[PDB]
Each structure stands twice: as structure tokens, then as C-alpha cells.
Amino acid sequence: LHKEPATLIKAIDGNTVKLMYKGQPMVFRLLLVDIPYGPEAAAFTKKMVENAKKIEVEFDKGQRTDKYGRGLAYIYADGKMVNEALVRQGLAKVAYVYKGNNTHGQHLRKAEAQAKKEKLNIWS
């Protein structure tokens, strides 16, 4: 897997963001992030992407867009994965793997388990 450069265009909600990617505007859905705290998750992703000096998108090895045309990726803000930060903060759950895109699933489930043990936010 490899990180590619992108530019924030705008924050949308906890697991959706609009980016300039290879010179075209594209809506991206954060892989493996399930939002059941919806405003809270939205605000967290919004801050994280808008303060970044560097946004990267990392496709997984399965299908790269969903049926609505959204890119399916891990999104990184200054080197930190947004998908993982949300889960570790207890602001989303880890989704069922979609079509071969599971490369970071174990890593994210470890972050979720930690959030759970700490009883954070959704794990109240």
C-alpha cells in the first residue's frame, strides 16, 4: 500500500471528506470506520483534516470506489491515520471488511479495543 498526496477541499462528516486527488475533486469514505456522537465524530475529523499541513490517501488492495463513486481509503493527516484516530477516541466502531479492503483491520480493532477498555465516548 502506498500513500498518495491530496489537498483538503472540505470536511463533510466523521467518515467522509472531499479532497483534490490527482487534480480532480473526489469524495472519500474512510475505510473500516462505522459511525453509529455523529456531530462529535464530524467535528473531530473536520479539525484533524483542516489543521493538517499534509493530507495523504492510501487505497487498500480491494475495490477502490463504492457504488456512489466515493473513494475507499485510509486518509492520513500529517502522517497520522484519521480512520485510526477516530476509532481510538471512541468516536466510531470498526466496520465489517468491504471487498478485500482490510489491510489495517487488525490495527484498527486494537485501537477500538483500547477505546472500549477506556470507556470513551461511544463506549460509555
N, CA, C and O atoms as CSV, one atom per row, in Angstrom:
chain,resi,resn,atom,element,x,y,z
A,1,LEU,N,N,0.866,-1.223,0.000
A,1,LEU,CA,C,0.000,0.000,0.000
A,1,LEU,C,C,0.874,1.234,0.000
A,1,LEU,O,O,1.946,1.240,0.604
A,2,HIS,N,N,0.423,2.281,-0.675
A,2,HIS,CA,C,1.234,3.452,-0.666
A,2,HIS,C,C,0.413,4.696,-0.503
A,2,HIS,O,O,-0.709,4.801,-0.998
A,3,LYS,N,N,0.997,5.643,0.206
A,3,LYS,CA,C,0.306,6.927,0.426
A,3,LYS,C,C,0.509,7.782,-0.793
A,3,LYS,O,O,1.605,7.823,-1.353
A,4,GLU,N,N,-0.542,8.472,-1.216
A,4,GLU,CA,C,-0.507,9.459,-2.307
A,4,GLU,C,C,-0.942,10.806,-1.749
A,4,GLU,O,O,-1.681,10.870,-0.767
A,5,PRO,N,N,-0.474,11.898,-2.390
A,5,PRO,CA,C,-0.782,13.243,-1.892
A,5,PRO,C,C,-2.188,13.640,-2.292
A,5,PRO,O,O,-2.697,13.232,-3.335
A,6,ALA,N,N,-2.800,14.441,-1.442
A,6,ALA,CA,C,-4.093,15.080,-1.738
A,6,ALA,C,C,-4.155,16.414,-1.030
A,6,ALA,O,O,-3.238,16.778,-0.293
A,7,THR,N,N,-5.239,17.147,-1.254
A,7,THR,CA,C,-5.409,18.518,-0.687
A,7,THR,C,C,-6.814,18.514,-0.172
A,7,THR,O,O,-7.744,18.198,-0.914
A,8,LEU,N,N,-6.996,18.857,1.087
A,8,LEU,CA,C,-8.362,19.117,1.516
A,8,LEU,C,C,-9.070,20.109,0.653
A,8,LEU,O,O,-8.553,21.183,0.344
A,9,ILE,N,N,-10.280,19.729,0.262
A,9,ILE,CA,C,-11.231,20.690,-0.244
A,9,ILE,C,C,-12.262,21.046,0.780
A,9,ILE,O,O,-12.489,22.231,1.027
A,10,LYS,N,N,-12.911,20.057,1.400
A,10,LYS,CA,C,-13.744,20.367,2.559
A,10,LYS,C,C,-14.066,19.149,3.361
A,10,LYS,O,O,-14.094,18.030,2.849
A,11,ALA,N,N,-14.313,19.381,4.642
A,11,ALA,CA,C,-14.684,18.348,5.577
A,11,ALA,C,C,-16.137,18.085,5.328
A,11,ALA,O,O,-16.882,19.020,5.034
A,12,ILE,N,N,-16.583,16.836,5.435
A,12,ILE,CA,C,-18.040,16.553,5.244
A,12,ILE,C,C,-18.674,15.997,6.548
A,12,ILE,O,O,-19.552,16.644,7.118
A,13,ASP,N,N,-18.252,14.838,7.011
A,13,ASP,CA,C,-18.728,14.324,8.323
A,13,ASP,C,C,-17.671,13.385,8.858
A,13,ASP,O,O,-16.549,13.381,8.351
A,14,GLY,N,N,-17.991,12.582,9.873
A,14,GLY,CA,C,-16.944,11.857,10.626
A,14,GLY,C,C,-16.141,10.923,9.726
A,14,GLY,O,O,-14.922,10.820,9.869
A,15,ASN,N,N,-16.827,10.233,8.785
A,15,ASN,CA,C,-16.065,9.330,7.928
A,15,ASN,C,C,-16.121,9.688,6.432
A,15,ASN,O,O,-15.910,8.814,5.591
A,16,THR,N,N,-16.401,10.956,6.085
A,16,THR,CA,C,-16.442,11.394,4.691
A,16,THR,C,C,-15.779,12.763,4.539
A,16,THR,O,O,-16.026,13.674,5.328
A,17,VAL,N,N,-14.930,12.895,3.509
A,17,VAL,CA,C,-14.224,14.152,3.256
A,17,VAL,C,C,-14.100,14.364,1.747
A,17,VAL,O,O,-14.063,13.403,0.979
A,18,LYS,N,N,-14.037,15.629,1.331
A,18,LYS,CA,C,-13.855,15.912,-0.121
A,18,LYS,C,C,-12.410,16.369,-0.331
A,18,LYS,O,O,-11.939,17.300,0.324
A,19,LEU,N,N,-11.719,15.704,-1.250
A,19,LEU,CA,C,-10.312,16.031,-1.479
A,19,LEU,C,C,-10.036,16.340,-2.937
A,19,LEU,O,O,-10.741,15.857,-3.823
A,20,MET,N,N,-9.003,17.150,-3.194
A,20,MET,CA,C,-8.430,17.195,-4.521
A,20,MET,C,C,-7.440,16.045,-4.617
A,20,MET,O,O,-6.493,15.971,-3.835
A,21,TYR,N,N,-7.658,15.140,-5.582
A,21,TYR,CA,C,-6.838,13.917,-5.665
A,21,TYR,C,C,-6.473,13.777,-7.166
A,21,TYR,O,O,-7.349,13.647,-8.021
A,22,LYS,N,N,-5.160,13.807,-7.454
A,22,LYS,CA,C,-4.601,13.788,-8.825
A,22,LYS,C,C,-5.359,14.814,-9.643
A,22,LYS,O,O,-5.812,14.534,-10.753
A,23,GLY,N,N,-5.491,16.001,-9.081
A,23,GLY,CA,C,-6.078,17.134,-9.784
A,23,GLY,C,C,-7.573,17.118,-10.058
A,23,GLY,O,O,-8.065,17.960,-10.809
A,24,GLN,N,N,-8.304,16.186,-9.469
A,24,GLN,CA,C,-9.762,16.163,-9.573
A,24,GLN,C,C,-10.344,16.127,-8.152
A,24,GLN,O,O,-9.798,15.453,-7.278
A,25,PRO,N,N,-11.452,16.851,-7.919
A,25,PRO,CA,C,-12.253,16.780,-6.684
A,25,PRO,C,C,-12.871,15.378,-6.555
A,25,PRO,O,O,-13.439,14.862,-7.517
A,26,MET,N,N,-12.760,14.768,-5.374
A,26,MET,CA,C,-13.271,13.423,-5.154
A,26,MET,C,C,-13.734,13.275,-3.710
A,26,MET,O,O,-13.004,13.628,-2.784
A,27,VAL,N,N,-14.947,12.753,-3.513
A,27,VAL,CA,C,-15.400,12.442,-2.125
A,27,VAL,C,C,-14.842,11.086,-1.702
A,27,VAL,O,O,-14.964,10.102,-2.431
A,28,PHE,N,N,-14.224,11.042,-0.507
A,28,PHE,CA,C,-13.648,9.832,0.055
A,28,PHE,C,C,-14.362,9.353,1.296
A,28,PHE,O,O,-14.756,10.148,2.150
A,29,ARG,N,N,-14.525,8.039,1.389
A,29,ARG,CA,C,-15.202,7.436,2.554
A,29,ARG,C,C,-14.108,6.728,3.295
A,29,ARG,O,O,-13.359,5.949,2.705
A,30,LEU,N,N,-13.997,6.990,4.622
A,30,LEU,CA,C,-12.902,6.399,5.389
A,30,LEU,C,C,-13.122,4.906,5.546
A,30,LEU,O,O,-14.133,4.480,6.105
A,31,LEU,N,N,-12.182,4.108,5.057
A,31,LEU,CA,C,-12.324,2.633,5.126
A,31,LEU,C,C,-12.415,2.113,6.580
A,31,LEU,O,O,-11.662,2.560,7.445
A,32,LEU,N,N,-13.330,1.179,6.838
A,32,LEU,CA,C,-13.426,0.413,8.083
A,32,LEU,C,C,-13.964,1.294,9.265
A,32,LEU,O,O,-13.919,0.863,10.417
A,33,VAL,N,N,-14.459,2.499,8.977
A,33,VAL,CA,C,-14.978,3.398,10.028
A,33,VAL,C,C,-16.462,3.410,9.956
A,33,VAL,O,O,-17.041,3.801,8.942
A,34,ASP,N,N,-17.099,2.980,11.033
A,34,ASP,CA,C,-18.559,2.952,11.080
A,34,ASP,C,C,-19.039,3.989,12.093
A,34,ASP,O,O,-18.656,3.907,13.260
A,35,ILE,N,N,-19.856,4.952,11.698
A,35,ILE,CA,C,-20.357,5.894,12.718
A,35,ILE,C,C,-21.783,5.504,13.159
A,35,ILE,O,O,-22.715,5.582,12.358
A,36,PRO,N,N,-21.959,5.086,14.430
A,36,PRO,CA,C,-23.320,4.748,14.900
A,36,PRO,C,C,-24.229,5.979,14.975
A,36,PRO,O,O,-25.396,5.863,15.349
A,37,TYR,N,N,-23.130,10.858,18.961
A,37,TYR,CA,C,-21.690,11.056,18.677
A,37,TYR,C,C,-21.357,11.284,17.200
A,37,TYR,O,O,-20.186,11.383,16.832
A,38,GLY,N,N,-22.386,11.364,16.362
A,38,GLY,CA,C,-22.231,11.733,14.937
A,38,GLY,C,C,-21.677,13.148,14.731
A,38,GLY,O,O,-20.779,13.343,13.911
A,39,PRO,N,N,-22.212,14.155,15.478
A,39,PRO,CA,C,-21.667,15.525,15.476
A,39,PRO,C,C,-20.237,15.562,16.029
A,39,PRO,O,O,-19.365,16.251,15.500
A,40,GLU,N,N,-20.027,14.808,17.097
A,40,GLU,CA,C,-18.713,14.689,17.692
A,40,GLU,C,C,-17.701,14.101,16.671
A,40,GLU,O,O,-16.582,14.601,16.554
A,41,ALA,N,N,-18.094,13.059,15.949
A,41,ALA,CA,C,-17.121,12.420,15.028
A,41,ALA,C,C,-16.844,13.391,13.884
A,41,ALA,O,O,-15.718,13.493,13.397
A,42,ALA,N,N,-17.901,14.111,13.462
A,42,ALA,CA,C,-17.799,15.101,12.346
A,42,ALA,C,C,-16.792,16.182,12.730
A,42,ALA,O,O,-15.897,16.514,11.952
A,43,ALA,N,N,-16.945,16.730,13.940
A,43,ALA,CA,C,-16.075,17.829,14.431
A,43,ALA,C,C,-14.596,17.384,14.559
A,43,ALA,O,O,-13.679,18.144,14.248
A,44,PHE,N,N,-14.396,16.150,15.017
A,44,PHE,CA,C,-13.065,15.581,15.176
A,44,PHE,C,C,-12.319,15.419,13.832
A,44,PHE,O,O,-11.199,15.907,13.679
A,45,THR,N,N,-12.947,14.732,12.870
A,45,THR,CA,C,-12.360,14.624,11.545
A,45,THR,C,C,-12.161,16.007,10.937
A,45,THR,O,O,-11.120,16.269,10.334
A,46,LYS,N,N,-13.153,16.910,11.088
A,46,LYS,CA,C,-13.062,18.279,10.491
A,46,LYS,C,C,-11.769,18.939,11.019
A,46,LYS,O,O,-10.952,19.402,10.223
A,47,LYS,N,N,-11.576,18.986,12.357
A,47,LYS,CA,C,-10.374,19.630,12.933
A,47,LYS,C,C,-9.118,18.959,12.436
A,47,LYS,O,O,-8.184,19.623,11.986
A,48,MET,N,N,-9.091,17.630,12.516
A,48,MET,CA,C,-7.905,16.903,12.120
A,48,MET,C,C,-7.461,17.177,10.669
A,48,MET,O,O,-6.275,17.401,10.428
A,49,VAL,N,N,-8.392,17.161,9.704
A,49,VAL,CA,C,-8.028,17.437,8.311
A,49,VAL,C,C,-7.766,18.924,8.036
A,49,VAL,O,O,-6.902,19.241,7.218
A,50,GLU,N,N,-8.493,19.852,8.700
A,50,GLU,CA,C,-8.328,21.257,8.370
A,50,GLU,C,C,-7.006,21.868,8.946
A,50,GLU,O,O,-6.460,22.819,8.386
A,51,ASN,N,N,-6.524,21.305,10.053
A,51,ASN,CA,C,-5.258,21.731,10.613
A,51,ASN,C,C,-4.066,21.083,10.028
A,51,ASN,O,O,-2.944,21.452,10.376
A,52,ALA,N,N,-4.245,20.100,9.123
A,52,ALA,CA,C,-3.086,19.349,8.661
A,52,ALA,C,C,-2.239,20.225,7.729
A,52,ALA,O,O,-2.795,21.062,7.018
A,53,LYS,N,N,-0.928,20.059,7.713
A,53,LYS,CA,C,-0.200,20.614,6.583
A,53,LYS,C,C,-0.063,19.638,5.387
A,53,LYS,O,O,0.369,20.039,4.306
A,54,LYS,N,N,-0.429,18.377,5.588
A,54,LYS,CA,C,-0.223,17.333,4.578
A,54,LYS,C,C,-1.381,16.312,4.706
A,54,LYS,O,O,-1.601,15.779,5.793
A,55,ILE,N,N,-2.109,16.038,3.629
A,55,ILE,CA,C,-3.160,15.018,3.609
A,55,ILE,C,C,-2.691,13.990,2.589
A,55,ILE,O,O,-2.272,14.343,1.487
A,56,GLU,N,N,-2.765,12.713,2.964
A,56,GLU,CA,C,-2.463,11.641,2.090
A,56,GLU,C,C,-3.631,10.663,2.049
A,56,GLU,O,O,-4.342,10.476,3.036
A,57,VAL,N,N,-3.813,10.039,0.873
A,57,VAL,CA,C,-4.815,8.974,0.749
A,57,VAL,C,C,-4.090,7.700,0.453
A,57,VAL,O,O,-3.107,7.686,-0.288
A,58,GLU,N,N,-4.578,6.618,1.035
A,58,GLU,CA,C,-3.905,5.324,0.851
A,58,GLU,C,C,-5.039,4.351,0.490
A,58,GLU,O,O,-5.815,3.960,1.362
A,59,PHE,N,N,-5.139,3.957,-0.798
A,59,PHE,CA,C,-6.076,2.856,-1.166
A,59,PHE,C,C,-5.601,1.567,-0.609
A,59,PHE,O,O,-4.406,1.357,-0.407
A,60,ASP,N,N,-6.558,0.682,-0.355
A,60,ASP,CA,C,-6.265,-0.675,0.039
A,60,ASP,C,C,-6.208,-1.550,-1.236
A,60,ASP,O,O,-6.140,-1.017,-2.343
A,61,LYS,N,N,-6.234,-2.861,-1.087
A,61,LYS,CA,C,-5.906,-3.709,-2.222
A,61,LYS,C,C,-7.164,-4.237,-2.882
A,61,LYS,O,O,-7.105,-4.962,-3.875
A,62,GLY,N,N,-8.309,-3.862,-2.314
A,62,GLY,CA,C,-9.577,-4.286,-2.892
A,62,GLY,C,C,-10.168,-3.196,-3.768
A,62,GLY,O,O,-9.436,-2.373,-4.318
A,63,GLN,N,N,-11.486,-3.187,-3.902
A,63,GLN,CA,C,-12.125,-2.161,-4.710
A,63,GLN,C,C,-11.901,-0.758,-4.143
A,63,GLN,O,O,-11.947,-0.531,-2.934
A,64,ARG,N,N,-11.660,0.157,-5.056
A,64,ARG,CA,C,-11.179,1.495,-4.687
A,64,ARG,C,C,-12.286,2.551,-4.673
A,64,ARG,O,O,-12.090,3.655,-4.166
A,65,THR,N,N,-13.444,2.209,-5.229
A,65,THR,CA,C,-14.604,3.143,-5.094
A,65,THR,C,C,-15.830,2.342,-4.736
A,65,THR,O,O,-15.953,1.181,-5.126
A,66,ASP,N,N,-16.746,2.951,-3.992
A,66,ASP,CA,C,-18.056,2.388,-3.767
A,66,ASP,C,C,-19.114,2.692,-4.879
A,66,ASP,O,O,-18.803,3.369,-5.858
A,67,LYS,N,N,-20.332,2.195,-4.715
A,67,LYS,CA,C,-21.316,2.329,-5.787
A,67,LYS,C,C,-21.744,3.761,-6.038
A,67,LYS,O,O,-22.224,4.091,-7.123
A,68,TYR,N,N,-21.572,4.615,-5.031
A,68,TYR,CA,C,-21.885,6.047,-5.157
A,68,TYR,C,C,-20.698,6.847,-5.720
A,68,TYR,O,O,-20.742,8.077,-5.748
A,69,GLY,N,N,-19.639,6.154,-6.169
A,69,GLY,CA,C,-18.440,6.829,-6.709
A,69,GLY,C,C,-17.430,7.368,-5.653
A,69,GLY,O,O,-16.471,8.046,-6.021
A,70,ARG,N,N,-17.633,7.079,-4.394
A,70,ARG,CA,C,-16.663,7.610,-3.390
A,70,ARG,C,C,-15.417,6.776,-3.290
A,70,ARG,O,O,-15.486,5.548,-3.355
A,71,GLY,N,N,-14.261,7.424,-3.132
A,71,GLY,CA,C,-13.020,6.719,-2.989
A,71,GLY,C,C,-13.024,6.003,-1.632
A,71,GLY,O,O,-13.535,6.546,-0.652
A,72,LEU,N,N,-12.467,4.807,-1.567
A,72,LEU,CA,C,-12.452,3.994,-0.331
A,72,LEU,C,C,-11.019,3.933,0.093
A,72,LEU,O,O,-10.218,3.226,-0.518
A,73,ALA,N,N,-10.660,4.695,1.179
A,73,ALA,CA,C,-9.218,4.798,1.504
A,73,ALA,C,C,-9.004,5.027,2.976
A,73,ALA,O,O,-9.927,5.358,3.721
A,74,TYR,N,N,-7.735,4.838,3.387
A,74,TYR,CA,C,-7.249,5.324,4.669
A,74,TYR,C,C,-6.721,6.749,4.425
A,74,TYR,O,O,-5.931,6.979,3.510
A,75,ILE,N,N,-7.164,7.684,5.247
A,75,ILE,CA,C,-6.793,9.103,4.995
A,75,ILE,C,C,-5.820,9.503,6.160
A,75,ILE,O,O,-6.065,9.189,7.325
A,76,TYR,N,N,-4.727,10.197,5.801
A,76,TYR,CA,C,-3.686,10.491,6.796
A,76,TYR,C,C,-3.571,11.976,6.860
A,76,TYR,O,O,-3.573,12.663,5.838
A,77,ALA,N,N,-3.468,12.485,8.093
A,77,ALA,CA,C,-3.296,13.952,8.259
A,77,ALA,C,C,-2.011,14.161,9.006
A,77,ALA,O,O,-1.887,13.737,10.155
A,78,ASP,N,N,-1.018,14.827,8.361
A,78,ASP,CA,C,0.364,14.927,8.906
A,78,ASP,C,C,0.878,13.569,9.369
A,78,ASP,O,O,1.426,13.454,10.465
A,79,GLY,N,N,0.707,12.545,8.544
A,79,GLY,CA,C,1.258,11.240,8.905
A,79,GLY,C,C,0.417,10.428,9.880
A,79,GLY,O,O,0.759,9.277,10.154
A,80,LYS,N,N,-0.654,10.973,10.406
A,80,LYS,CA,C,-1.443,10.205,11.353
A,80,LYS,C,C,-2.710,9.735,10.627
A,80,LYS,O,O,-3.361,10.521,9.938
A,81,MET,N,N,-3.054,8.460,10.783
A,81,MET,CA,C,-4.316,7.980,10.136
A,81,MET,C,C,-5.574,8.505,10.839
A,81,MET,O,O,-5.760,8.293,12.037
A,82,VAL,N,N,-6.430,9.190,10.080
A,82,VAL,CA,C,-7.697,9.721,10.610
A,82,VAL,C,C,-8.614,8.572,11.006
A,82,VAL,O,O,-9.292,8.647,12.031
A,83,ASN,N,N,-8.644,7.482,10.185
A,83,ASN,CA,C,-9.556,6.390,10.489
A,83,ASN,C,C,-9.218,5.821,11.872
A,83,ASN,O,O,-10.106,5.594,12.694
A,84,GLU,N,N,-7.932,5.598,12.115
A,84,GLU,CA,C,-7.494,5.061,13.418
A,84,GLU,C,C,-7.764,6.052,14.571
A,84,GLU,O,O,-8.220,5.637,15.637
A,85,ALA,N,N,-7.493,7.333,14.373
A,85,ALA,CA,C,-7.638,8.344,15.461
A,85,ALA,C,C,-9.072,8.352,15.893
A,85,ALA,O,O,-9.334,8.476,17.089
A,86,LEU,N,N,-10.050,8.225,14.965
A,86,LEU,CA,C,-11.463,8.281,15.349
A,86,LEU,C,C,-11.821,7.141,16.171
A,86,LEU,O,O,-12.495,7.278,17.192
A,87,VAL,N,N,-11.372,5.963,15.741
A,87,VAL,CA,C,-11.690,4.758,16.471
A,87,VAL,C,C,-11.039,4.796,17.891
A,87,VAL,O,O,-11.678,4.438,18.881
A,88,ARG,N,N,-9.777,5.231,17.964
A,88,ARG,CA,C,-9.010,5.194,19.236
A,88,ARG,C,C,-9.662,6.162,20.225
A,88,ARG,O,O,-9.599,5.972,21.440
A,89,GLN,N,N,-10.285,7.195,19.679
A,89,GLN,CA,C,-11.028,8.225,20.514
A,89,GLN,C,C,-12.419,7.738,20.851
A,89,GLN,O,O,-13.169,8.433,21.535
A,90,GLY,N,N,-12.782,6.531,20.372
A,90,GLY,CA,C,-14.106,6.008,20.666
A,90,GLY,C,C,-15.246,6.748,19.954
A,90,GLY,O,O,-16.385,6.755,20.422
A,91,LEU,N,N,-14.922,7.360,18.832
A,91,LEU,CA,C,-15.909,8.171,18.108
A,91,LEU,C,C,-16.463,7.389,16.885
A,91,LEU,O,O,-17.401,7.846,16.232
A,92,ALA,N,N,-15.885,6.232,16.589
A,92,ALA,CA,C,-16.505,5.303,15.602
A,92,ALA,C,C,-16.182,3.871,15.960
A,92,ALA,O,O,-15.262,3.615,16.736
A,93,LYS,N,N,-16.938,2.925,15.397
A,93,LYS,CA,C,-16.639,1.499,15.520
A,93,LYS,C,C,-15.913,1.016,14.254
A,93,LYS,O,O,-15.878,1.724,13.248
A,94,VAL,N,N,-15.339,-0.187,14.312
A,94,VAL,CA,C,-14.609,-0.737,13.175
A,94,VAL,C,C,-15.626,-1.532,12.370
A,94,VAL,O,O,-16.324,-2.394,12.904
A,95,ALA,N,N,-15.701,-1.230,11.081
A,95,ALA,CA,C,-16.721,-1.838,10.196
A,95,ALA,C,C,-16.264,-3.197,9.779
A,95,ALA,O,O,-15.080,-3.530,9.845
A,96,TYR,N,N,-17.235,-3.991,9.341
A,96,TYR,CA,C,-17.010,-5.229,8.608
A,96,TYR,C,C,-16.218,-4.910,7.347
A,96,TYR,O,O,-16.557,-3.987,6.606
A,97,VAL,N,N,-15.161,-5.683,7.109
A,97,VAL,CA,C,-14.324,-5.525,5.936
A,97,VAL,C,C,-15.159,-5.502,4.645
A,97,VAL,O,O,-15.992,-6.382,4.429
A,98,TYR,N,N,-14.934,-4.496,3.792
A,98,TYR,CA,C,-15.610,-4.377,2.474
A,98,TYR,C,C,-14.673,-4.787,1.331
A,98,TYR,O,O,-13.714,-4.076,1.032
A,99,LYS,N,N,-14.946,-5.926,0.694
A,99,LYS,CA,C,-14.295,-6.354,-0.536
A,99,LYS,C,C,-12.752,-6.385,-0.632
A,99,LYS,O,O,-12.182,-5.739,-1.512
A,100,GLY,N,N,-12.087,-7.115,0.247
A,100,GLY,CA,C,-10.633,-7.140,0.246
A,100,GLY,C,C,-9.886,-5.970,0.858
A,100,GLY,O,O,-8.657,-5.996,0.935
A,101,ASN,N,N,-10.622,-4.919,1.304
A,101,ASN,CA,C,-10.021,-3.773,1.959
A,101,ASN,C,C,-9.945,-3.942,3.501
A,101,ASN,O,O,-10.786,-3.412,4.228
A,102,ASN,N,N,-8.960,-4.661,3.967
A,102,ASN,CA,C,-8.876,-4.994,5.360
A,102,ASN,C,C,-7.459,-4.876,5.854
A,102,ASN,O,O,-7.155,-5.303,6.967
A,103,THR,N,N,-6.578,-4.302,5.043
A,103,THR,CA,C,-5.151,-4.378,5.379
A,103,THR,C,C,-4.916,-3.794,6.775
A,103,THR,O,O,-4.094,-4.320,7.526
A,104,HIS,N,N,-5.621,-2.718,7.135
A,104,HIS,CA,C,-5.427,-2.134,8.513
A,104,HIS,C,C,-6.440,-2.571,9.533
A,104,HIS,O,O,-6.538,-1.972,10.603
A,105,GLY,N,N,-7.219,-3.632,9.220
A,105,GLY,CA,C,-8.311,-4.011,10.140
A,105,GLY,C,C,-7.838,-4.428,11.542
A,105,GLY,O,O,-8.414,-4.008,12.545
A,106,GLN,N,N,-6.801,-5.244,11.603
A,106,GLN,CA,C,-6.279,-5.698,12.889
A,106,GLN,C,C,-5.816,-4.522,13.734
A,106,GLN,O,O,-6.117,-4.433,14.924
A,107,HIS,N,N,-5.071,-3.613,13.090
A,107,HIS,CA,C,-4.583,-2.424,13.735
A,107,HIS,C,C,-5.686,-1.552,14.288
A,107,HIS,O,O,-5.621,-1.134,15.444
A,108,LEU,N,N,-6.712,-1.263,13.476
A,108,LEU,CA,C,-7.890,-0.526,13.948
A,108,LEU,C,C,-8.688,-1.263,15.031
A,108,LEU,O,O,-9.177,-0.623,15.962
A,109,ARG,N,N,-8.833,-2.588,14.934
A,109,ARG,CA,C,-9.546,-3.290,16.028
A,109,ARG,C,C,-8.783,-3.194,17.375
A,109,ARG,O,O,-9.410,-3.108,18.431
A,110,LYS,N,N,-7.448,-3.209,17.336
A,110,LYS,CA,C,-6.647,-2.983,18.541
A,110,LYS,C,C,-6.984,-1.572,19.158
A,110,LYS,O,O,-7.186,-1.448,20.367
A,111,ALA,N,N,-7.036,-0.553,18.308
A,111,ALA,CA,C,-7.415,0.820,18.753
A,111,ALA,C,C,-8.845,0.865,19.335
A,111,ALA,O,O,-9.095,1.549,20.327
A,112,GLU,N,N,-9.770,0.131,18.708
A,112,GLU,CA,C,-11.131,0.059,19.219
A,112,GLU,C,C,-11.194,-0.628,20.569
A,112,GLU,O,O,-11.938,-0.197,21.450
A,113,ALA,N,N,-10.421,-1.695,20.744
A,113,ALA,CA,C,-10.452,-2.457,21.953
A,113,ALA,C,C,-9.951,-1.537,23.081
A,113,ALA,O,O,-10.511,-1.515,24.176
A,114,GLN,N,N,-8.893,-0.786,22.787
A,114,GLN,CA,C,-8.375,0.186,23.765
A,114,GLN,C,C,-9.427,1.288,24.179
A,114,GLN,O,O,-9.633,1.541,25.365
A,115,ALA,N,N,-10.059,1.910,23.188
A,115,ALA,CA,C,-11.169,2.860,23.378
A,115,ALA,C,C,-12.258,2.274,24.269
A,115,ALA,O,O,-12.766,2.939,25.171
A,116,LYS,N,N,-12.609,1.021,24.002
A,116,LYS,CA,C,-13.599,0.257,24.780
A,116,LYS,C,C,-13.165,0.076,26.246
A,116,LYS,O,O,-13.929,0.370,27.166
A,117,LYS,N,N,-11.949,-0.404,26.446
A,117,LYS,CA,C,-11.408,-0.589,27.795
A,117,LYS,C,C,-11.408,0.759,28.590
A,117,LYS,O,O,-11.619,0.761,29.803
A,118,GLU,N,N,-11.175,1.872,27.906
A,118,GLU,CA,C,-11.162,3.204,28.495
A,118,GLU,C,C,-12.562,3.800,28.585
A,118,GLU,O,O,-12.745,4.887,29.133
A,119,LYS,N,N,-13.560,3.080,28.040
A,119,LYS,CA,C,-14.971,3.528,28.061
A,119,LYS,C,C,-15.167,4.917,27.467
A,119,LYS,O,O,-15.888,5.739,28.033
A,120,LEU,N,N,-14.525,5.186,26.322
A,120,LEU,CA,C,-14.569,6.508,25.700
A,120,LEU,C,C,-15.785,6.694,24.847
A,120,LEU,O,O,-16.116,5.845,24.019
A,121,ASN,N,N,-16.464,7.822,25.050
A,121,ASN,CA,C,-17.435,8.352,24.102
A,121,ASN,C,C,-18.498,7.309,23.720
A,121,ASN,O,O,-19.401,7.057,24.517
A,122,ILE,N,N,-18.423,6.697,22.530
A,122,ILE,CA,C,-19.471,5.690,22.229
A,122,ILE,C,C,-19.428,4.476,23.140
A,122,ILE,O,O,-20.422,3.760,23.261
A,123,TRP,N,N,-18.283,4.233,23.789
A,123,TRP,CA,C,-18.173,3.064,24.671
A,123,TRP,C,C,-18.493,3.401,26.118
A,123,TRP,O,O,-18.264,2.589,27.015
A,124,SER,N,N,-19.024,4.606,26.348
A,124,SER,CA,C,-19.732,4.919,27.605
A,124,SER,C,C,-20.860,3.933,27.874
A,124,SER,O,O,-21.554,4.049,28.884
